[PDB]
Write a protein that binds this DNA or RNA. Structure first.
Ligand SMILES: [Mg+2]
Ligand SMILES: [Mg+2]
Length: 150
RNA sequence: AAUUGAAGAGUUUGAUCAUGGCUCAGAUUGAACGCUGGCGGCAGGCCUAACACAUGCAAGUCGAACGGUAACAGGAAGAAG
């Protein structure tokens, strides 16, 4: 069964003529724990509800990745907007070593051990999906062997 | 057998994304200060005035190199209570 995790919940203001109205935005990541991971960004005027919305959207935007064992193939660089990401497969008995929301994304995607680092802005929203871009463009030996033989 | 290696957070805005500074979570020391203080092992102990120094000790040893009896530990002769 899928597992879901909540990264952060924020508050945003609209300052209408009448006054100031506050809304809540939630970011969540869902995944099967083997190959499939997705993220959702929901909003609402109450917390519990925004979370719900997010989950729904995440489930419907899962993506697939190839994982040599519980680890990546090769080092990959992820970039989006203003957040750079770097990851290394590392050995097996090392645990997960990552920062804010990278632990969430990788654990949900099913990476039991990896070395990760974030450069530039650390904005949960960008860092999420910046990791996922790298996992997207990761190339596996099986799909690179389509060139010829092995 | 002797390469098992990399975490971030707070803070500018009504709110957002950047840029950019400040601050914190770690480790370490020949440390000092405050409160407190049972024992043991190993190590350490003037980082400032190469400023000035009372007192004691820290370079002596060879008679199997040679003249010698100033100490005195023996012996012999001689003079003697
Ligand atoms: Mg920055
Ligand atoms: Mg002496």
């Amino acid at each position: 069964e899928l597992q879901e995790k909540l990264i952060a919940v924020n508050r945003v203001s609209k300052t209408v003529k009448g006054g100031r109205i506050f809304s809540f935005t939630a970011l969540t990541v869902v995944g099967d724990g083997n190959g499939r991971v997705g993220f959702g960004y929901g909003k609402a005027r109450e917390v519990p509800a925004a979370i719900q919305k997010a989950m729904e959207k995440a489930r419907r935007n899962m993506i697939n990745v190839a994982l040599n064992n519980g680890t990546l193939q090769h080092p990959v660089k992820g970039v989006h907007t203003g957040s750079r990401v770097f990851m290394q497969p590392a050995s097996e008995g090392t645990g997960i070593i990552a920062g804010g929301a990278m632990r969430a994304v990788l654990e949900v995607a099913g990476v039991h051990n990896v070395l990760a680092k974030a450069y530039g802005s650390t904005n949960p929203i960008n860092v999420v999906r910046a990791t996922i871009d790298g996992l997207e463009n990761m190339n596996s030996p099986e799909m690179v062997a389509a060139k010829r033989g092995k």
